[PDB]
Amino acid sequence: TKCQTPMGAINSSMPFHNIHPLTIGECPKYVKSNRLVLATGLRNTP
Amino acid sequence: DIVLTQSPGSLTVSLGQRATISCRASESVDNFGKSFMHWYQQKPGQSPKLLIYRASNREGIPARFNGSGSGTDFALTINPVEADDVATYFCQQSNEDPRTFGGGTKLE
Amino acid sequence: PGDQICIGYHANNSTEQVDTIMEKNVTVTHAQDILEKTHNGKLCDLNGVPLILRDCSVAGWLLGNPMCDEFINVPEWSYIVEKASPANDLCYPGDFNDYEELKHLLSRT
Amino acid sequence: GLFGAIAGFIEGGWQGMVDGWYGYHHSNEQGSGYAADKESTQKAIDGVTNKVNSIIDKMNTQFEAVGREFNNLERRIENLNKQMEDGFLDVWTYNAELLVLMENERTLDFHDSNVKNLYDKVRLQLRDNAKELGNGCFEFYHKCDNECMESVKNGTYDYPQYSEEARLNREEI
Amino acid sequence: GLFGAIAGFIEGGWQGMVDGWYGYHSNEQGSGYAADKESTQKAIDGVTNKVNSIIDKMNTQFEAVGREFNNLERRIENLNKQMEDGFLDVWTYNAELLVLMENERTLDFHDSNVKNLYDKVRLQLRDNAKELGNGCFEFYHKCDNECMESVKNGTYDYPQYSEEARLNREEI
Amino acid sequence: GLFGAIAGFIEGGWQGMVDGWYGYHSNEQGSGYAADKESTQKAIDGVTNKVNSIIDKMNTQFEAVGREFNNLERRIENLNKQMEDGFLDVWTYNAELLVLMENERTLDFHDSNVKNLYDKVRLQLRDNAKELGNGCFEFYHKCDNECMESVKNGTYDYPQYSEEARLNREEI
Numbered sequence: 103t104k105c106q107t108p109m110g111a112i113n114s115s116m117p118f119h120n121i122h123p124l125t126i127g128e129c130p131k132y133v134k135s136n137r138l139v140l141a142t143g144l145r146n147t148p
Numbered sequence: 149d150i151v152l153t154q155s156p157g158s159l160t161v162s163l164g165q166r167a168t169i170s171c172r173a174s175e176s177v178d179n180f181g182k183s184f185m186h187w188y189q190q191k192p193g194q195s196p197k198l199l200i201y202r203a204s205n206r207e208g209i210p211a212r213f214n215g216s217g218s219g220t221d222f223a224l225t226i227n228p229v230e231a232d233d234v235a236t237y238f239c240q241q242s243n244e245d246p247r248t249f250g251g252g253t254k255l256e
Numbered sequence: 257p258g259d260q261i262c263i264g265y266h267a268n269n270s271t272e273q274v275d276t277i278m279e280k281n282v283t284v285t286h287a288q289d290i291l292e293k294t295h296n297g298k299l300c301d302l303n304g305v306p307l308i309l310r311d312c313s314v315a316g317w318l319l320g321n322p323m324c325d326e327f328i329n330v331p332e333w334s335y336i337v338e339k340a341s342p343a344n345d346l347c348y349p350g351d352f353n354d355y356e357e358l359k360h361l362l363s364r365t
Numbered sequence: 366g367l368f369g370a371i372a373g374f375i376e377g378g379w380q381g382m383v384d385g386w387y388g389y390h391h392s393n394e395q396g397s398g399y400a401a402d403k404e405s406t407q408k409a410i411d412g413v414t415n416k417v418n419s420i421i422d423k424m425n426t427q428f429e430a431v432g433r434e435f436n437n438l439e440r441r442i443e444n445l446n447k448q449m450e451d452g453f454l455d456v457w458t459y460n461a462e463l464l465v466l467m468e469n470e471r472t473l474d475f476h477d478s479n480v481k482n483l484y485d486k487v488r489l490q491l492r493d494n495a496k497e498l499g500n501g502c503f504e505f506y507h508k509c510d511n512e513c514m515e516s517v518k519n520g521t522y523d524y525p526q527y528s529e530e531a532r533l534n535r536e537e538i
Numbered sequence: 539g540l541f542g543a544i545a546g547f548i549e550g551g552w553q554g555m556v557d558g559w560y561g562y563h564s565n566e567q568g569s570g571y572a573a574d575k576e577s578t579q580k581a582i583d584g585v586t587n588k589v590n591s592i593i594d595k596m597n598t599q600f601e602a603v604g605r606e607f608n609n610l611e612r613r614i615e616n617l618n619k620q621m622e623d624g625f626l627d628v629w630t631y632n633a634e635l636l637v638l639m640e641n642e643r644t645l646d647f648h649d650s651n652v653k654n655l656y657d658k659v660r661l662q663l664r665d666n667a668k669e670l671g672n673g674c675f676e677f678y679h680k681c682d683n684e685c686m687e688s689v690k691n692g693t694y695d696y697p698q699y700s701e702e703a704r705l706n707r708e709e710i
Numbered sequence: 711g712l713f714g715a716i717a718g719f720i721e722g723g724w725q726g727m728v729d730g731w732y733g734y735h736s737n738e739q740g741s742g743y744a745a746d747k748e749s750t751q752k753a754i755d756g757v758t759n760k761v762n763s764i765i766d767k768m769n770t771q772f773e774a775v776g777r778e779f780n781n782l783e784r785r786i787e788n789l790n791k792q793m794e795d796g797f798l799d800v801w802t803y804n805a806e807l808l809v810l811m812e813n814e815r816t817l818d819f820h821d822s823n824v825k826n827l828y829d830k831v832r833l834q835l836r837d838n839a840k841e842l843g844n845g846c847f848e849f850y851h852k853c854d855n856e857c858m859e860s861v862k863n864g865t866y867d868y869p870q871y872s873e874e875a876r877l878n879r880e881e882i
């Protein structure tokens with residue numbers, strides 16, 4: 103792996119992760135969120 | 149296949165001098181910034197032994213062994229040469245299956 | 257009866273929802289997840305290079321606890337793995353002075 | 366939204382337009398069909414893409430937690446160290462969450478604004494040569510063939526060319 | 539403001555409308571104020587969610603802890619103080635700025651709701667009424683209380699009044 | 711931009727207007743540029759307060775302090791370093807982001823001031839002039855310099871020109 107945490111390794115291109123704060127290697131930035139999703143498109147109609 | 153060719157085939161060096169064994173890879177064995185070359189020592193009449201991993205760092209191995217090189221060609225340097233160094237030395241690459249070894253170089 | 261032109265905007269079968277200050281769960285046509293939530297549940301090698309102490313502690317390793325023979329001559333490591341409360345520490349009881357400062361030095365090695 | 370277009374005076378989007386975000390639906394004698402305004406769509410794509418890339422860029426100097434060990438008589442600095450780590454983790458989580466919430470809101474209003482501008486782009490060209498139906502549609506006071514439709518779509522409408530036949534059609538009404 | 543309505547082309551608010559933020563008439567049956575329930579409720583929901591979101595985003599804020607140190611721990615004492623003040627200053631900035639920024643957006647949000655309400659009526663009336671340019675539309679036809687109610691709930695039947703409107707435009 | 715005016719329906723700025731940011735004519739007495747003093751001063755006040763508010767919000771920023779440690783204090787040395795870099799990185803983000811965000815709002819603020827200025831004139835002129843659709847209104851009557859000045863200071867007497875305008879519309 104390229105990024106390791108005490109719970110397991112990370113294979114991701116996400117800029118954020120919520121696996122565990124203590125990591126080593128090229129890693130996403132840890133955050134305490136359950137969810138981080140950006141709107142890119144527009145408001146969808148039903 | 150990454151054909152590994154060692155040179156010279158047999159090397160006789162005076163005691164207390166410098167043995168210089170070369171390795172040449174058909175294609176590079178060298179990405180992630182590190183070289184994935186390894187040197188092995190087979191003292192006569194027994195299984196091979198690990199000397200150098202990723203081309204430069206020693207595994208309980210005396211400093212007399214200088215792992216050097218990058219890319220397509222490398223070199224195991226034994227200096228000073230001691231008595232218990234009679235062996236055939238092998239370089240093997242791990243950069244890409246199938247794992248391939250050198251012909252091997254016998255030291256006298 | 258007459259020719260006409262209309263201005264309008266895209267829509268699709270997306271169910272992806274997104275949050276804002278004034279509104280929650282806003283279905284949107286396109287969204288990008290930027291939070292990674294999965295790992296392989298395993299300790300792994302780091303860029304082709306770890307020293308796993310198993311049931312040994314750093315003290316046990318460095319002082320040479322006889323139950324720690326696996327590590328008599330360990331190769332280069334990427335990172336070091338130690339259990340929370342390893343069994344094989346100081347087999348003969350006592351103390352390791354400035355132990356934490358020694359673990360710190362290790363972590364830079 | 367902020368600009369009254371998306372889910373506003375234009376009540377609904379078109380499943381039918383698929384080659385872009387904003388565009389036109391025309392209807393003449395030669396037939397009807399959807400078409401995306403390539404220009405305003407590309408502008409929005411560039412804007413949103415730069416936005417996404419800017420958000421990810423601004424976060425490269427974020428805090429990175431480091432393992433540190435302490436003994437039973439170092440409980441104070443252990444706790445200080447923990448508070449420091451959680452401290453920054455909480456700050457940066459706020460920063461990421463808030464940034465996403467704020468720019469999401471601006472993004473939705475950005476699309477709303479691109480649409481309202483597109484509508485105005487057509488309106489300011491057509492003037493009295495067409496009637497504002499008030500739903501995003503303009504009913505023409507003259508004949509608009511496919512080539513005429515294309516001139517409205519690429520901002521080359523020749524208002525005075527149709528001015529007379531438009532004016533005459535307005536006045537029998 | 540940003541959208542030209544509040545303190546803009548509509549120069550002033552009405553003390554008289556009290557059942558809402560935004561709203562509307564004057565015909566033969568008489569005049570009176572009325573709030574647009576829909577746009578008002580939308581704004582109330584938006585602002586309320588905004589307030590609740592601001593208070594929500596702050597639950598993981600820094601909390602200072604008492605810690606004691608002796609005369610030979612002045613360095614970590616000071617480090618600890620800088621750390622505490624450090625976070626206190628950050629979170630004070632975050633609260634102050636968030637309030638300033640969302641206040642500005644809130645005022646413009648109301649401005650936008652109003653401008654949208656005006657446009658909602660305008661796009662219905664079209665040539666059936668005249669834009670006085672002050673938030674008022676003068677009708678080209680008779681608009682009884684039920685007609686007033688259709689404009690207010692978005693069910694104006696434009697073509698029903700189209701003819702009597704057109705005739706009244708043309709003697710003008 | 712957000713409001714469709716700057717680099718929008720008004721495609722380009724005027725090198726010629728130099729006494730302000732936003733402004734205005736062409737009649738028989740001659741043509742010339744003039745800045746709308748009111749909307750310009752409002753924008754100047756807004757931007758100046760904005761700049762001053764940004765610099766103000768940053769006075770309680772982190773200030774790094776020299777601290778020394780020995781070979782057996784490597785842990786708190788590192789803790790201290792992480793703390794300092796920690797705050798330096800936070801405040802650098804805060805300054806960079808604040809500037810990026812308020813820059814974007816500033817450009818759209820100008821766009822909005824312009825679009826409001828155009829609407830200010832439009833709502834005065836009504837059918838007394840024709841929207842050319844490029845920021846210009848072609849008059850349906852004679853507008854001398856004093857008339858030009860009434861449009862510019864919001865005192866246009868619409869009904870005074872109403873009749874001569876209406877007559878000129880109808881031969882068209």
Ligand SMILES: *[C@@H]1O[C@H](CO)[C@@H](O[C@@H]2O[C@H](CO)[C@@H](O[C@@H]3O[C@H](CO)[C@@H](O)[C@H](O)[C@@H]3O)[C@H](O)[C@H]2NC(C)=O)[C@H](O)[C@H]1NC(C)=O
Pocket residue numbers: 275280281
């Ligand atoms: C967006 O909508 C989703 C889907 O409704 C929301 O997530 C849902 O939230 C409800 C609570 O309102 C969850 O119900 C909970 O389920 C647990 C399961 O153990 C149970 O104890 C109770 O039934 C409890 O109420 C529900 O599981 C959850 N669904 C999913 C898929 O996560 C979410 O809240 C909405 N987002 C916002 C901002 O409102």
